[PDB]
């Protein structure tokens, strides 16, 4: 798609003096399309070194600079990573739209031992200082585990964060993953994903990242996602394709999520960075072709296979 | 009914420089009647998507803009919702009296697993900033689960919030639902509802939203509510009708709660928004007809059934 | 008794520019006698509606304004109530000495389920703003459950509160009720009450409200209380008479607590407010007669029965 | 012993503008000797009324004013008490060096029920305001229960407290009593006491109060204490003689703690205050004679019996 | 090795007006080499008096001034210790690069009883005040136990600390020891060590201190460490040699860790301070010779044995 500055709907918690900044950031993050292509680079904490070294993982992924190379050479809307990770590389990679992921936890403590809690790692002022030091921070990210016994803590953190972010004209993406004792088998039930989507709207987020819901007898995964996209209202819903599948199967999933599921984009992590730099760059281009330029699966697969190139300036 | 500005009892925690604002907000919230018709739109967190999509729920309710269309085209005192929900739509719906619901939780953790706790989602300054950016925020809302093992945290948050709200001349509605291990079967006992109403006054609330108490051998639900309205003193008690009954039964409950139970208004949520826009608008008009304009049940039912229209009698 | 401004002992934590305000408030609270007659109106939270409606309770008590009428038309030293309760009526009842009860809890969670904790409901600044809006706030109240597993939270709240109160020249009354798993059986042992009294001094309170200790083989309740009054040193101890006894027994209990037990006054709640307005007013006059003006039990009983009037000026 | 202002080692967290104040306070607290005689008056919270009324306790101890009379009439380095207790009496007892005990707990919850936690009762600003109102506050006290499940909370409180106190040129004494599930039988083991003393230094304390360690087969209590005094480095270690025992045995214990155990003084509570005023005052004089003036046990006992007097001049 | 000021990569969270200070501190800490020789003196809290008195520990280690004498007479990059410890001695030992260890806990509560938590002991402002009072504070240290049930608290303290330190131009060393019920036997698995190293980067640390990983069928300890050094990216990884091996084996471990494992330095505590002053000083010199001056194991061992002296080659960092 394509949008103008005037088409950006500025929420009422973005103050008058931050209005233009917010529009700048929304236009950057969505690359002037209204759609969010998110490259997720926050998994060094979440899964430790699991997604970065081992069987089936390209050796270049063992070096963190790999992520910044992909973001710089590939086509993405935003690169989402922890403040410190961005801090150590952004000087050499200034032409990326950075989304600072505000909280993180490891996966060492499993749900069965204790419900998940992912704490805000630092205040917003630390991000603002970095922005004021030349870093192109366009927004913030935060994860909520609804149904966790620690839900309250994350709700309180997330709610305050969205307010402060919009005060500064930063966009906000919430990862909402209902997880815990209470949730169990219902983790990817259609109602759970839809619930998650509605909560992000109520908190004031610009975008919400959810798991794709399971297919039911009644509906496909994408068809169930439509309910969640509706529930999120003026908050854009972004989803994920399976990390395990073929490149064409993956691109088909993303296409369905947008055109049948009503998603406003996607969030892709290990599926990109576990590949060699060349193949990873080609994948981001194929993903962005669907997400930002309305390419059908066939033409996107051509981009991935290197038969065609893709650039935003056309 | 009708009240004038001079009939508004300004409590002593509304400071001199916030007095006129408080009166403005009290008049707006009650539509110049002293009665509170509250349209509850906070349940997207509370019950996730359960109240907004599924069997018996109109397809229009799956879009959250439905709620703002109802508040704007219907007749309500206030629309109560989370800060973020209001933020995303308020610019396109400016002519609504907003009550910002300060806390929320999901219903995923049941009481049997752990006692309930609903945390304040952000500071009051976030709401004030939104107000100063042109949003018609008239007051704040907050839920307390008395008898929860987490009661103390909610008492501390609510107490401070009432003081800060009145400092700014905003009205405060407290939802008080005693819930927990300790409460159980006594959730809707007359003594419990009365206890809840009394606590809200001590915290300094302008209004308290409680469950209707169960009927006993000696007294009806509405008759038992009278004890709670009394306990609340100068804090107005608002109640709710059954979400499950027929429209006439619902409107009778509301009438009885006011005229027998001594309620100063009502809070209605899913009973409104689960209906199509037209029928939802008609229901807000029927409710407001009773609450704001003293309509008989019969005449209110005619508004619900579309036989008569309803608009506000006086504007201030 | 009778005291002058010069006889008021100003503690060292009352700052220089707050000295006169502290003296004003001490003279008001003690009605120029040094003795504290406290009318407790904080039980709408503590016991919910149990103390205000039901059998043996006058129908007028179901309306909260009843409490303010009693305080206005009766004779009291201070009326103790929550900030919010006071806020709703004080404009219509300005000529009362208000003591703002800073913390409260309900009685729904029993000790056997979990140890008690009563949280500070707001900051002191909220009380100060109400004072500066013309409410005659002479002091603050706070409850500590010593021996509770939540003891530490209340000790930290109380200690800070006393310091800030005296900084502003407000008086402080601490309710100290040892309660919890650890206490149980010993709630009203002489040593428990004496311990409670001593702690209030160490926190720096002007007055401490305790339960009366049980009688022992060796000593009467009042005799056991003498040990607690001694332990409290320059902090005045106040106590309560039995809730369910005859008015003459009750007044004899208060007299004993003062003259045998060394109490500096009393705190009475439901015994007063559960009565009809006229009888409630007479009881406050009878209590104040003993506490403030040194009446014997007979003459005070005569005041209760309406054979004699009582007022402070004369 | 005797020290001059120049001999006071000012730690580097005492800021330039607080330097002279710190020296003033160190000289006051140690009475110009470098040794700390601490009179402990904080037990009204710690053990409720148990140390102040009952069998074997003099009747005068039931009135809290007893504590201040002793502090003023006897000879002490500092009087350690809660802020509130000091607030109610200090106006009538201005010539005492006050140490404000910043945290307290009661003894109602035993270790077996739950591990101990003693919370900071108020901010430091509260003490500073009292100081600026003319109260002679020379420093602060704080208790840590290492090995408690609540250890972390007390470490965070104590660490910040030391920094702020030195910023204001106040001295800091830390009570360190390892206590909890994890400690149990090891409460007064030589390694435990030495561990405690080392932690105080790491937090930046000027002095540390510990229990004396038990005797072992190889070493006496006092001999075991030397290890702790060494571990404490430039933090002075103060100890305690056996609670309300014989005056001679008590003074002999304190003497051994200093000259064999390497202690920099003592912290005494109920052994002093549970006595009648006169005898309490004489005991403070006897304790001070050993701690401040290097008296042997025999001459300190003479002071206790009133056969000799003892003063700072 | 040797680096110049221009070769120091200044992260983007070090603000414009803190940049020169940050470089000053990075140059001081690494002695102008880019390598970190860290002398750890924080174990008086961590292990109580266990590392400082007892069998096989020199009697001089029972006096804490021992640590400052070693730091002053030996050759070290930074001396890491608690704020209080540093405060009591720093005036008499001004010519040391101090790293203030921000958190500490005792070892009294074992994992089996409760997962570990080491709390921040005071605010950063306390350290800043000391720096402005003349103490040569070059950086801060903090320990995180990943996989502990208290992981969240430490993540939050550490993240905020890194941001604040860099705002002030201070370097940051994170000790990251995954520890807890959830970790157990996996404490020193190669993947665990690599995970820990990667987290330190994400928080924004300048250096990360980890345990050496165990050897596996496939790889030696040092070969396994290479994966962790890679995961840490632009955060320098520092490791440790065994405390109970012979001096030669110890110095060989450190050498392997650098040249095979990709370490940017080392952290050594009790192996130094449990020795007599003279021997301790000689060991720091041996370690620093490998770490800062690229010595072979054999020539470093000669320094340890007192056959040769060792001093720094370059002092362009004043």
Describe this protein's structure.
The structure is a homopentamer. Chain A is 39% helix and 12% strand. Chain A has 314 residues and is of the alpha/beta class. The first copy, chain A, has twelve helices and eight strands. Chain A has one domain (1-314): Aldolase class I (TIM Barrel, Alpha-Beta Barrel), CATH 3.20.20.70. Chain A has helices at 19-29, 43-46, 65-73, 83-89, 124-131, 151-167, 190-203, 221-231, 247-259, 270-273, 277-293, 297-304; strands at 36-40, 78-82, 98-101, 137-144, 171-176, 207-209, 236-238, 265-268. In chain A, helix 9 packs parallel to helix 11 (277-293) and helix 9 packs antiparallel against helix 12. Chain A has an eight-stranded parallel beta sheet with strand order 7-6-5-4-3-2-1-8. Chains in contact: A-B, A-E, B-C, C-D, D-E. At the C-D interface, helix 6, helix 7 and helix 8 of C face helix 4 and helix 5 of D.
Mind sketching the topology for me?
Five copies of one chain form a homopentamer.
Chain A: H1 19-29, E1 36-40, H2 43-46, H3 65-73, E2 78-82, H4 83-89, E3 98-101, H5 124-131, E4 137-144, H6 151-167, E5 171-176, H7 190-203, E6 207-209, H8 221-231, E7 236-238, H9 247-259, E8 265-268, H10 270-273, H11 277-293, H12 297-304
Parallel strand pairs in A: 1-2, 1-8, 2-3, 3-4, 4-5, 5-6, 6-7
Helix pairs in contact in A: 3-11, 7-8, 8-9, 9-11, 9-12, 11-12
PDB class: lyase
Keywords: PSI-Biology, mcsg, Midwest Center for Structural Genomics, fructose-bisphosphate aldolase, lyase
Assembly: pentameric
**What's the helical proportion of residues of chain A?**
25-40%
Number of strands of chain A: 8
Distance between the termini of chain A: 13 Å
Number of domains of chain A: 1
PDB class: lyase
Keywords: PSI-Biology, mcsg, fructose-bisphosphate aldolase
Assembly: pentameric
Entry title: Fructose-bisphosphate aldolase from Slackia heliotrinireducens DSM 20476
């Amino acid at each position: 798609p394509k949008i103008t500055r005037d088409q950006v709907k500025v929420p009422a918690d973005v103050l008058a003096d931050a209005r233009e900044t917010y529009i700048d950031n929304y236009m950057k993050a969505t690359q002037g399309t209204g759609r969010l292509m998110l490259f997720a680079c926050d998994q060094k904490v979440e899964h430790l070194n699991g997604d970065f070294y081992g069987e089936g993982i390209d050796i270049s992924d063992s070096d963190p600079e790999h992520l910044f190379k992909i973001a710089d050479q590939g086509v993405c809307g935003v690169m989402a990573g922890q403040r410190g990770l961005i801090a150590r590389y952004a000087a050499d990679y200034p032409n990326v739209n950075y989304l600072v992921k505000m909280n993180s936890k490891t996966n060492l403590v499993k749900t069965a031992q204790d419900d998940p809690y992912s704490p805000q790692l630092h205040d917003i002022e630390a991000v603002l200082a970095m922005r004021d030091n030349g870093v192109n921070v366009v927004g913030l990210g935060y994860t909520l585990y609804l149904g966790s016994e620690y839900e309250a803590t994350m709700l309180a953190e997330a709610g305050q964060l969205v307010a402060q972010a919009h005060e500064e004209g930063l966009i906000v993406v919430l990862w909402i993953y209902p997880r815990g004792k209470a949730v169990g088998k219902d983790e990817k039930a259609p109602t759970t994903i839809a619930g998650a989507a509605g909560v992000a709207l109520c908190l004031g987020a610009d975008f919400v990242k959810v798991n794709p819901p399971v297919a039911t007898e009644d509906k496909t995964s994408a068809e169930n996602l439509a309910v969640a996209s509706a529930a999120a209202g003026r908050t854009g819903l972004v989803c994920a394709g399976g990390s395990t599948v073929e490149a064409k199967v993956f691109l088909q999933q993303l296409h369905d999520q947008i055109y049948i599921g009503g998603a406003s984009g996607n969030a892709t992590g290990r599926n990109i960075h576990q590949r060699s730099l060349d193949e990873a760059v080609r994948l981001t281009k194929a993903i962005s072709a669907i997400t930002l330029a309305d390419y059908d699966v066939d033409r996107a697969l051509a981009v991935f296979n290197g038969e065609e190139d893709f650039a935003l300036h056309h």
